[PDB]
Every structure is written in C-alpha cells, then in structure tokens.
Amino acid sequence: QKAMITDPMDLLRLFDGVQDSTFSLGTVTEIAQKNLPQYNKQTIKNTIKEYAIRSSGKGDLPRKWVIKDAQNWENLRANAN
C-alpha cells in the first residue's frame, strides 16, 4: 500500500502538468506540489511513477513524460462532467 493521489480533480491537475514535461522526475514533482500543496512529495512521486513514463529520446524529441493509459485519463476527464 503506497500512498497516492486519489481525488480525480487533483489527478487531472497533476496530469496537465506531467504530460509533455521534459524535466526530471525531481523537478516534475516540485512543480506538481506547488499546484497541489496538501500532498507530500513522496506521494506525488508515487503517483507519477504509477501513471506516467519518461520516454528515451532517440535524439528527438527529448525525454518527455506521458500518461500511459490515455483511456483512463479520458474517464477522469469525464467524471469532471
């Protein structure tokens, strides 16, 4: 049981800031915590490691993050009506 973000609206706010970010995990966390100050970095990190993945740029484009399950993401966008 590793602690994660579960509020959908919070997950959405996380995703819109992880998706396409080229920054390291560290920086990508720090930035997320600003937008989600209630959580502790480890939880954010845990959440990122869960839903996202850092590409390995074959040159282009550089290493960016993507949410692995575009489906699920769309459901969370739908739960927001």
Curated annotation (Swiss-Prot):
Miscellaneous: Present with 1590 molecules/cell in log phase SD medium.
Family designation: Belongs to the RLF2 family.
Gene name as annotated: RLF2
Protein's name in the database: Chromatin assembly factor 1 subunit A
Subcellular location: Nucleus
Assembly: Component of chromatin assembly factor 1 (CAF-1), composed of MSI1/p50, CAC2/p60 and RLF2/CAC1/p90. Interacts with SAS2.
Species assigned in the record: Saccharomyces cerevisiae (strain ATCC 204508 / S288c)
Function according to Swiss-Prot or TrEMBL: Acts as a component of the histone chaperone complex chromatin assembly factor 1 (CAF-1), which assembles histone octamers onto DNA during replication and repair. CAF-1 performs the first step of the nucleosome assembly process, bringing newly synthesized histones H3 and H4 to replicating DNA; histones H2A/H2B can bind to this chromatin precursor subsequent to DNA replication to complete the histone octamer. Plays a role in the maintenance of heterochromatin.
